[PDB]
Amino acid sequence: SSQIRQNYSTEVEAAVNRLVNLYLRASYTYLSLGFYFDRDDVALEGVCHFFRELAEEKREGAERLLKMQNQRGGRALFQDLQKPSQDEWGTTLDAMKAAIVLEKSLNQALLDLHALGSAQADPHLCDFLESHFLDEEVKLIKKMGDHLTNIQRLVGSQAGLGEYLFEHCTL
Amino acid sequence: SSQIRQNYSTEVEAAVNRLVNLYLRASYTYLSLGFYFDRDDVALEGVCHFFRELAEEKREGAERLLKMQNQRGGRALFQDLQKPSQDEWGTTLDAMKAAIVLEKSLNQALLDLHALGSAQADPHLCDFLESHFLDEEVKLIKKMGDHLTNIQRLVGSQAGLGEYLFEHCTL
Amino acid sequence: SSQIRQNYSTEVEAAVNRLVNLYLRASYTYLSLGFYFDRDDVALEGVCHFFRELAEEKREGAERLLKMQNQRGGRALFQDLQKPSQDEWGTTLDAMKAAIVLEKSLNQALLDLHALGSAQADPHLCDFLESHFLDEEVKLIKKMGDHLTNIQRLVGSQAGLGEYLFEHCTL
Amino acid sequence: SSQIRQNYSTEVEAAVNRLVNLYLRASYTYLSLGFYFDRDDVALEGVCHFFRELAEEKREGAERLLKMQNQRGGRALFQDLQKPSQDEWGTTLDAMKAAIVLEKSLNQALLDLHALGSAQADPHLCDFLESHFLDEEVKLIKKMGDHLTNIQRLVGSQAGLGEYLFEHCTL
Numbered sequence A, B, C, D: 001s002s003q004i005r006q007n008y009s010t011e012v013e014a015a016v017n018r019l020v021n022l023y024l025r026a027s028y029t030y031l032s033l034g035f036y037f038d039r040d041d042v043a044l045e046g047v048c049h050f051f052r053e054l055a056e057e058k059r060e061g062a063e064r065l066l067k068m069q070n071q072r073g074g075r076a077l078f079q080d081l082q083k084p085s086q087d088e089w090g091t092t093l094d095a096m097k098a099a100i101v102l103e104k105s106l107n108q109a110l111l112d113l114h115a116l117g118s119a120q121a122d123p124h125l126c127d128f129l130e131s132h133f134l135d136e137e138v139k140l141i142k143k144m145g146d147h148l149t150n151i152q153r154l155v156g157s158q159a160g161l162g163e164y165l166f167e168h169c170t171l
């Protein structure tokens, strides 16, 4: 059973298991994104590598949650990992948009679990999320927003392309 | 506009801009303090260096807030930086007293923004302040209180001066 | 008071204090420019870094002036730092144009203070400006003019973009 | 005779010879100051070393002027070096006051020679003084003013002594 569990509600335990599922599903979505850009008829290896690295980060996030589940004396329970929402991911722009949607949904789930932990007076959980997940997600979303802007600029116009080249190759 | 902003209230955005102003104003006060002690008719270079280093720390605090503003998808807005409250800063004791007043006012502003973030259920903001600012301010205020005590002891009496020398040159 | 002041007119002392203000205001303008380009909806990090580095250079210029003020036995007096002329800075081209306007205004202020020092027969001041500021400003303005030309070329046309790429990636 | 002399007035040549004399006399005054503080009944070796180092700097200043005299095709002419104005130099405070008087008189002589060079349209001379002497004198006078303030503070009072110790042994 558990000799260790203290101040760890069944509501948080359940929500932690759900968040693990969401992180693993995110990892799986990114695996699909990465191999799509590795297709010979797409062939954007930088984009492939970006998404494959994100698959690894999301997996690592799930494993940290699972480690924490056991540290608190909760019981990891795994569900079906639903296949990604698309089989083909369109352009770099389409993919980066789908990625930011995905991250904002993980972010919201983190914030929801944080609010639950707060309601349950579970400061360990709250700190765990703050320390390992909330700032990581904020940083990643800012980087993806940056990328979305640059992709839009580059695909949009002569002026846009110009500004990118000056910044990248001069500054 | 912003593709990234999530769970980031207009109230916090505004308060962050105000706190940047207060940190920059603090930095400017410390620049003035440092150059006052560099005057040939004051000539306390250790005191000058202490305040100039604080000017840099307060600037760095503002820049971290501005970075965070952008990471959250808020919009940095800058105001007039009001000149420091004094043109001449009196003795080392007067200056260290003015410094602790200034830090306690920054501290209170941090605590006020923390309470706002808490009311707004913005755990990212709360953690950001805790991790980068609240303990830094507590440590600095304790160091300034230490200094105030030693300055008072040294300027006050034979017994005071004695105790300082034993501690400094023997212990 | 001052045991050291020699050949240092009240007119130069005052003008030095004003120039410190202008350099600090320039630094503040560049802080605003840098964080604008760090926005997720602008996202030109090279441009951000260029302006943030200029903020630091302008701050260092003010500190050197303040050091010189004290070395001559003048009294540093600080005024309100007026907020930058814009909250949003437009394109890279708009920003680099605003930057060169700003530098030419600092340059003219340097030349005006130089003429004053010359009228006042203050060769120390004249040399200080020549040695630490006039050539620095000339070099920076030439670099910004270079940048303005390249930005215009890159945003302007196929021929322009072509010439830039050949120069950058071949030569 | 001189195959090299160009744009080098007899007025500047003469004034350069006089300035060499003043620098050598300053060096001699500092030699006397240094050995006075080496007396067993005075015994302030730090003060001795400060003045002996200044004797060397003033000698080096004269030698640089003499080198410049020859580089311009002028003729070094040496006069009697008058013995220092005092045989005994009183307290550290008295000595540092006499030192700043001496430096201000060298400084004024530099500024006078600068004005002559300017009147004579001799930019080489003007630059030579600016580059090797005017800023050196400004820095040294600021350091002596600093010292005068600290000596006065230390000899004056409990509060003064206190402030010095805090700055020196804490900051």
Ligand SMILES: [Au+]
Pocket (backbone or CB within 6 Å): A034, A038, A045, A046, A047, A048, A049, A050, A052
């Ligand atoms: Au890849």
Ligand SMILES: [Au+]
Pocket (backbone or CB within 6 Å): A113, A114, A115, A117, A118, A125, A126, A127, B123
């Ligand atoms: Au929480």
Ligand SMILES: [Au+]
Pocket (backbone or CB within 6 Å): A117, A118, A123, A126, B123
């Ligand atoms: Au919490």
Ligand SMILES: [Au+]
Pocket (backbone or CB within 6 Å): A117, A118, A121, A122, A123, A124, A126, A127
């Ligand atoms: Au909590």
Ligand SMILES: [Au+]
Pocket (backbone or CB within 6 Å): A118, A122, A123, A126, A127
């Ligand atoms: Au908490």
Ligand SMILES: [Au+]
Pocket (backbone or CB within 6 Å): A114, A125, A126, A127, A130, B123
């Ligand atoms: Au929390």
Ligand SMILES: [Au+]
Pocket (backbone or CB within 6 Å): A165, A168, A169
């Ligand atoms: Au590039």
Ligand SMILES: [Au+]
Pocket (backbone or CB within 6 Å): A165, A169, C165, C168, C169
């Ligand atoms: Au390129």
Ligand SMILES: [Au+]
Pocket (backbone or CB within 6 Å): B034, B038, B045, B046, B047, B048, B049, B050, B052
């Ligand atoms: Au200093």
Ligand SMILES: [Au+]
Pocket (backbone or CB within 6 Å): B113, B114, B115, B117, B118, B125, B126, B127
């Ligand atoms: Au908070």
Ligand SMILES: [Au+]
Pocket (backbone or CB within 6 Å): B117, B118, B123, B126
């Ligand atoms: Au909180």
Ligand SMILES: [Au+]
Pocket (backbone or CB within 6 Å): B117, B118, B121, B122, B123, B124, B126, B127
């Ligand atoms: Au919070």
Ligand SMILES: [Au+]
Pocket (backbone or CB within 6 Å): B118, B122, B123, B126, B127
């Ligand atoms: Au919190």
Ligand SMILES: [Au+]
Pocket (backbone or CB within 6 Å): B114, B125, B126, B127, B130
């Ligand atoms: Au908090």
Ligand SMILES: [Au+]
Pocket (backbone or CB within 6 Å): B165, B168, B169, D169
């Ligand atoms: Au000591």
Ligand SMILES: [Au+]
Pocket (backbone or CB within 6 Å): B165, B169, D169
């Ligand atoms: Au001591």
